[PDB]
Amino acid sequence: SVWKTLNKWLPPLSRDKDWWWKTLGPQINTLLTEADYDLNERYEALLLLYRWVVPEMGPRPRSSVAPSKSFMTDDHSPIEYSWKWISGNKKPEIRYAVELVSPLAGSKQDPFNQIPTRNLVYNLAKIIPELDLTWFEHFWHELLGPGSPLTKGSTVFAALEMLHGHLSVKVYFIPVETPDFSAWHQIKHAIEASGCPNLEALNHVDAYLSSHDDGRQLRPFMLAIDLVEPAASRLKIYARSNQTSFRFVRDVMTIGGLRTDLDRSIEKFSDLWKRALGLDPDTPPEDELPKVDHLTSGAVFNFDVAPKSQIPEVKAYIPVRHYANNDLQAALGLIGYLEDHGHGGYSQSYLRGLDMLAPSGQLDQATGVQTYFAVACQGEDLSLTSYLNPQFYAAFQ
Numbered sequence: 001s002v003w004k005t006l007n008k009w010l011p012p013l014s015r016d017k018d019w020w021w022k023t024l025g026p027q028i029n030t031l032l033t034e035a036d037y038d039l040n041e042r043y044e045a046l047l048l049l050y051r052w053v054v055p056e057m058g059p060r061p062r063s064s065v066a067p068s069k070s071f072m073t074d075d076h077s078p079i080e081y082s083w084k085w086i087s088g089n090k091k092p093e094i095r096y097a098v099e100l101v102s103p104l105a106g107s108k109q110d111p112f113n114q115i116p117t118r119n120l121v122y123n124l125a126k127i128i129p130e131l132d133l134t135w136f137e138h139f140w141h142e143l144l145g146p147g148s149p150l151t152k153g154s155t156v157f158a159a160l161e162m163l164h165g166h167l168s169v170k171v172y173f174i175p176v177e178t179p180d181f182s183a184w185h186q187i188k189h190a191i192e193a194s195g196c197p198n199l200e201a202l203n204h205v206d207a208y209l210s211s212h213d214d215g216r217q218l219r220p221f222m223l224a225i226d227l228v229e230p231a232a233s234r235l236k237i238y239a240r241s242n243q244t245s246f247r248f249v250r251d252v253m254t255i256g257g258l259r260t261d262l263d264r265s266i267e268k269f270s271d272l273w274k275r276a277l278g279l280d281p282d283t284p285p286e287d288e289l290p291k292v293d294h295l296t297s298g299a300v301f302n303f304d305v306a307p308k309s310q311i312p313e314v315k316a317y318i319p320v321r322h323y324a325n326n327d328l329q330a331a332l333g334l335i336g337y338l339e340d341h342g343h344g345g346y347s348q349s350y351l352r353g354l355d356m357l358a359p360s361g362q363l364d365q366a367t368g369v370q371t372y373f374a375v376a377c378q379g380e381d382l383s384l385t386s387y388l389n390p391q392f393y394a395a396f397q
């Protein structure tokens with residue numbers, strides 16, 4: 001084991017740092033091993049974890065109660081893994097998002113816990129010069145700086161994507177809302193001041209959000225960027241709705257019909273939706289889901305409005321934790337879909353990863369491990385991603 005070797009030879013850590021090391025290291029290491037990552041990349045990932053992430057995770061969990069109301073997950077776990085299914089039986093992509101913390105969190109010196117993520121990004125910029133911080137600094141200044149202004153629990157976090165051979169970094173900004181400045185207002189002004197050459201996709205999304213009947217029901221809340229050249233980065237605007245019928249999801253995926261030639265992709269999406277969510281196969285698409293009242297309940301989407309494209313791209317997130325019956329049932333639904341379409345070469349590796357992450361004896365009894373199933377429509381096929389919560393506090397061992 002890579003983690004066993006590193007833990008055996010790297011210098012020992014404080015109580016909190018050692019807890020985070022001996023918890024995250026095995027999790028990330030198992031996920032990467034099941035995805036058949038090369039040994040060098042597992043070493044690199046765990047060395048990054050030991051050097052730049054573990055020292056900034058703050059106190060270790062010691063009870064069911066979290067030290068913050070972090071927006072990363074529902075139990076405020078500050079770490080979220082993700083497992084992207086690659087078509088053609090290729091190796092899955094492993095990513096993880098983290099919101100680092102400091103003792104100044106909540107104080108006047110960092111009221112929204114922003115400096116640790118900035119520090120992490122700059123450290124990574126020292127090790128990987130390929131990363132570009134132009135758009136990072138621009139959107140940070142626009143959305144979280146002293147000129148920026150109700151909070152969702154966090155205002156920023158970062159994500160590492162191990163893309164087999166190189167590392168990519170992503171930044172999520174969650175603006176603070178005021179009666180005069182909605183999150184969407186701030187995001188739109190930030191993108192307009194970003195310096196993009198072709199704002200056709202942003203204007204399409206704005207028209208859909210403002211004038212369309214169902215598009216008016218989406219509440220923008222988050223913006224994600226890639227730390228690459230601004231011409232090569234995506235601009236992902238996340239939007240939530242209390243509506244949950246599959247008809248609504250179907251229309252949002254098309255952006256009110258702006259996107260065409262997706263009927264087969266949408267039929268496969270409906271099949272996967274009912275399988276993962278445990279619904280009856282004859283569920284009318286206009287039926288709403290049984291009501292779940294939560295901060296992150298309802299249907300979630302993201303629009304990619306990156307200038308390279310004139311038409312925006314939509315990714316939908318099936319909220320497994322809120323509407324499925326249990327983690328094993330949803331996992332088998334997703335896995336059966338993948339097997340029916342010849343894309344399930346890594347299903348058993350995924351199940352071993354789930355069993356690694358799951359609180360002892362709760363996969364078939366509760367939800368929570370799998371937060372989202374992300375679906376995108378690529379021509380006739382689906383691009384799928386599983387999002388995973390280690391549940392440090394909801395499942396405190």
Ligand SMILES: N[C@@H](Cc1c[nH]c2ccccc12)C(=O)O
Nearest residue numbers: 071072073074296300317372387
């Ligand atoms: N925790 C928030 C934000 C979030 C974290 N990871 C996500 C992945 C997809 C969509 C949203 C999120 C939520 O569940 O909504």
